[PDB]
Copies of this chain bind each other. A is one copy, B any other.
Amino acid sequence: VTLFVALYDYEARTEDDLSFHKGEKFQILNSSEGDWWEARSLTTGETGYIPSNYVAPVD
């Protein structure tokens, strides 16, 4: 399972976080040890940490 969709919008707080919009999809290979996962957006191509509670596996 590596495809996840955003449930809510999110505005990055720092340079390493990724901002994104609800409905946006990501590739997330491995989850982290924390609440923050490193993702790549399939829309913008950008990469960065996202809060793991904001996405769900794409059905």
Contacts and interface: CB of A to CB of B under 8 A. Distances in A.
A42 B52 CA distance: 13
Interface residues of A, number: 20
A42 B30 CA distance: 22
Nearest to A44: B13
A35 B23 CA distance: 9
A48 interface: no
Contacts of A21: 7-8, 53-54
Interface of A: 7-8, 13, 21-25, 30, 32-33, 35, 42-45, 51-54
Given A7-B21, A23-B35, A24-B51, 13 more contacts: A8-B21, A13-B44, A13-B45, A21-B53, A21-B54, A23-B53, A24-B53, A25-B35, A32-B32, A32-B33, A33-B33, A35-B42, A43-B53
